[PDB]
Structures are given as C-alpha cells and as structure tokens.
Amino acid sequence: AQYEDGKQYTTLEKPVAGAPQVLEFFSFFCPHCYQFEEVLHISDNVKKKLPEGVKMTKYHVNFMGGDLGKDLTQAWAVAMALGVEDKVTVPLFEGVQKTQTIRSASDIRDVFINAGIKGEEYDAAWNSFVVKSLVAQQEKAAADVQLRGVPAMFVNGKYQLNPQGMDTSNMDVFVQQYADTVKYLSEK
Ligand SMILES: O=C(O)c1sc(Cc2ccccc2)nc1-c1ccccc1
C-alpha cells in the first residue's frame, strides 16, 4: 500500500481507550520539538488538513530536563488553563534552547510575565488544583502509551506517527507528508 504500518506510522499494541483524537507530546528541551514548532509549524499544518473543529491536544512531558522538565510540564498546565499557549510557546522554546536563559521555575515565570500574564494570575494558576489536575492529565496521557520519545503524535489512541519514515531532504515535503499521514490515519 501507499501507507503501511511500519513506514509512515506504527500501530499501538495496546490501544488507548478514550484518548484525544490528535495527541502531540513535546518537551521544551526537545530539539526536533523546537523545529516542529518554529521551523516546521507541524501543528498548524496538520490542523489545516483536518476537518474543521476537530480537537487537537498538545501535552508537555517530564522525562527530559530533570527538575526543570517537570517545572515546564506544570508551566504548560498553567498555559493551557489560562489559554495562553500561543503567547509563551516560542519564548519558552527559545529561553530553554536558544538563549538558555531558563534555568529555574522563576525564569519560567519571567517568560509569562513578559508575555503579559499578570503576576497574581500566574502564581494563582501555578498553585491551583485545576493545574495539579492538568499536570496529572499530561502525565497520564504519556503513561498510557509508554512514551519514551518526542516529538510524538498519536491518532485516535491507536496510531503513532513515524517521522523517520519520511523524506527529510525537503522540509516542506516532510511537513505535508506528516500532515497527509495524520489525515489518512484520522479517516480510518
Ligand atoms: O528523522 C529525522 O532525522 C528528523 S528530520 C526532522 C525535521 C526536518 C525535516 C526535513 C528537513 C530537515 C529537517 N525531524 C526528524 C525527527 C526525528 C526523530 C523523531 C521525530 C522527528
């Protein structure tokens, strides 16, 4: 076939009941995640090729960056709760990987403050049980598929994208091959 298990995607031995339709995992410590966000815009390009209104979900993971990696999963929980993902993703990625000015939870907080989130509303979210729960939910989603690598995308809790099965001679072809594969997988 044109699409084959083992090539553009792999199939989960343990299908995940009730997982989100399009599920991405990333780490602000992940170098290809940096690319996926800044260079490739994987998410937007998948969204343009999916039917309107369908849910894409994106979660942070703990297993890179030790203490700070976990701080970052909590910060991502804060961004989701406040709905400011678009405001802090680039500055968080660059703070960790480009300028390397993010070395503590306080530095992470600075990024939100600079992006115009009020100090009071940051700290309140950071400390909230709503956020504790959003941290739990990110961990659980990752756990359900024994995630050991990012960036990762899962479709309908069954299928996992295999980016290394795709052309990397050309960034634009990669992206469209990636997006087209997600579309195909969602139509199963
Ligand atoms: O498999 C690889 O080497 C590449 S290439 C890439 C971005 C890109 C595309 C086209 C041209 C230049 C760069 N992401 C990956 C990747 C690797 C492991 C897991 C997930 C993704």
Tell me which DSSP letter residue 20 carries. Answer: -
Q: Is 174 in the pocket of ligand 1 (CB under 6 A)?
A: yes
Q: Which alpha helices (H) appear in 13-128, and where do they start and end? A: 31-34, 42-49, 66-82, 85-93, 105-114, 119-126
Residues linked to residue 22 through DSSP beta bridges, in sequence order: 56, 155
Whether 123 and 132 have beta carbons less than 8 Å apart is answered as no
Q: Total domain count for the chain? A: 1
What CA–CA distances, in Å, run from 22 to 43, 60, 81, 108? 10, 14, 19, 27
Do the bridges between strand 159-161 and strand 56-60 make them parallel or antiparallel, or are there none, so unpaired?
unpaired
The closest residue, in CA terms, to atom 21 on ligand 1 is 163
Domain of 7: which CATH number?
3.40.30.10
Q: Which atom of ligand 1 is nearest to the CA of 173?
A: 10
Rounded CA separation 24/26 (Å)? 7
Per the structure, the complete domain to which residue 154 belongs is given by 1-188
Q: Is 63 in the pocket of ligand 1 (CB under 6 A)?
A: no
Instruction: Please state how this structure was obtained.
Output: X-ray
Most informative mutation of 10, 26, 35 for ligand 1 (most atoms within 8 A of CB): 35
**Distance of CA 52 from the midpoint of ligand 1 (Å):** 27
Look up tokens 């500055």; give the residue: 91
Q: Is 128 in the pocket of ligand 1 (CB under 6 A)?
A: no
Contacting residues for 52 by C-beta, under 8 A, at least 6 apart:
none
Residues linked to residue 148 through DSSP beta bridges, in sequence order: none
